[PDB]
Amino acid sequence: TYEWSSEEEEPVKKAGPVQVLIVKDDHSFELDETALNRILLSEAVRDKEVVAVSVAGAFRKGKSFLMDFMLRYMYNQESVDWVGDYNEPLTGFSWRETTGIQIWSEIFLINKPDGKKVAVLLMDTQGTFDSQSTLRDSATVFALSTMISSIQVYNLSQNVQEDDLQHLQLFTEYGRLAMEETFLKPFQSLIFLVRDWSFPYEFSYGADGGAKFLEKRLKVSGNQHEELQNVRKHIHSCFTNISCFLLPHPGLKVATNPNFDGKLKEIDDEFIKNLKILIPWLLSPESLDIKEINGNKITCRGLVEYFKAYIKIYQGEELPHPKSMLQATAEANNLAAVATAKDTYNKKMEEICGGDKPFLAPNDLQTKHLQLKEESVKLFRGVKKMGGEEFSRRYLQQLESEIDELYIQYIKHNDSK
Ligand SMILES: Nc1nc2c(ncn2[C@@H]2O[C@H](COP(=O)(O)OP(=O)(O)O)[C@@H](O)[C@H]2O)c(=O)[nH]1
Ligand SMILES: [Mg+2]
């Protein structure tokens, strides 16, 4: 979908959400690999370390409203009035579904304070999120988004309830297994966003009140027991960062109205004030947490391998075993190393004999190929990979065989000139 600009005196492609995880009507789960590759394997982002921002929680609790303002920020980080004009209707940016995961088609490229340009990915994860519902659709889409995310924004209404915390059991024992095998915490940031907070006199709006409130909800106490003692004891060994932000109610007009579409000044003022703090608190350059596993920052190319590894175990009749989750993580970590190594081979061959570049003598083509293949083998060998050397051996063999396939296609192409 293109659209006219005249700001650029030109047509421009229209960014929008893209369905990547799909819960079908028979309750089967499909990953749209094609759609995912189109977004994450493009030349501008493929090699960039990725920040995967997920917003997840129950239907109809303001996830798409909040992501509208996330888009406002990401598109106007330079301006200090990124939020828009108050006597203006909320123009410009809109997300809006069924159970699944959508991603914003445009990957944002941001400079971290130290100067590294990273890629920011935005995800919206929806389901019923009712723990008494007897079907696993919402749990699996929530587990998957969390496994993919480096910032998971858990969007809740009014409180953190025991049943909200029970969903974190999906990653409890995995996080310990992962912990014990990599000697590092498996996840980066978890954020409890409490909407419609009504008790600012007890815990103030925003991050500081949020911290104290969460600390008191997360107390272990034998009145919970029932493995919510457990989840509370283990959540910190899963996540590098855990925090909580309390947000006022937006006012009647916003609540009672699907797509309220009015002047920003009609929204409740305290809510707008805290929303303007929330978004940069989540998404500013210093705040962006790069996806990371086994001490390796993950790229847009690499992240695709985590998508593919996880869908394998989240499909089927039931949720996966915790050891299967860890197996899937180790498999993606090795395949990400394969993709990186294969990529640098591919780019360097492309420079030597792709395009209209002149014919190459076959012996010289071969000698250049062997040198580049061996460089990528050493590159792959040097990556700190999960699973141990026997586990990784089969992935080295896959890299060698995929590089060979590339070389054959270059021979074929070089034979046409
Ligand atoms: N009570 C309440 N309603 C909200 C909030 N933010 C947005 N809404 C409204 O709730 C309705 C559904 O919101 P939506 O973003 O589509 O929810 P989603 O299904 O989680 O994405 C819309 O009319 C919004 O205007 C909030 O913080 N609190
Ligand atoms: Mg939504």
Token look-up 């989840």 returns 231
Residue 140, classified by CB atoms within 10 Å of its CB into exposed (0-12), middle (13-18) or buried (19+), is: buried
Question: What's the N-to-C CA distance of the chain in angstroms?
Answer: 37
Q: Specify the DSSP element, H or E, that contains 286.
A: none
Q: Is 124 annotated as a binding residue?
A: no
Q: What distance in Å separates the CA atoms of residue 56 and residue 154, rounded to the nearest whole number?
A: 5
Q: 116 by DSSP, 3-state: which?
A: coil
For 155, the 3-state DSSP assignment is strand
Look up the CATH number of domain 2-333: 3.40.50.300
Q: What is the Å distance from ligand 2's center to 124 Cα? A: 6
Pocket of ligand 1 (CB under 6 A): 59-65, 96, 195-196, 249-250, 254-255, 257-258, 260
For a mutational test of ligand 1's pocket, the pick from 55, 98, 254, 256, i.e. the residue with the most ligand atoms closer than 8 A to its C-beta, is 254
Q: Match 């995880």 to its residue by tokens.
A: 21
Q: How far is CA 18 from CA 48, 220, 415, in A?
A: 20, 40, 40
| Elucidation technique | X-ray
String of b and e for 5-24 (b: at least 16 CB within 10 Å)?
A: eeeeeeeeeeeebbebbbbe
E-strand stretches of 169-322: 187-195, 239-246, 292-293, 296-297
Does 312 carry a binding-site annotation? no
Residue 290 DSSP class: P
Tokens 């070389």: give the residue.
407
Structure tokens at 192: 């409890």
Q: List the residue whose alpha carbon is closest to atom 26 of ligand 1.
A: 62
- Longest CA–CA separation in the chain, Å: 79
Checking 160-164 for CB contacts under 8 A at 24+ apart, the result is: 160/192, 160/194, 160/213, 160/214, 160/217, 160/244, 162/224, 162/228, 163/131
Residue 408 burial (C-beta neighbours within 10 Å; 0-12, 13-18, 19+): exposed
Contact 150, 189 (CB under 8 A): yes
Instruction: Return the closest-CA partner of residue 122 out of 51, 66, 38.
Output: 51
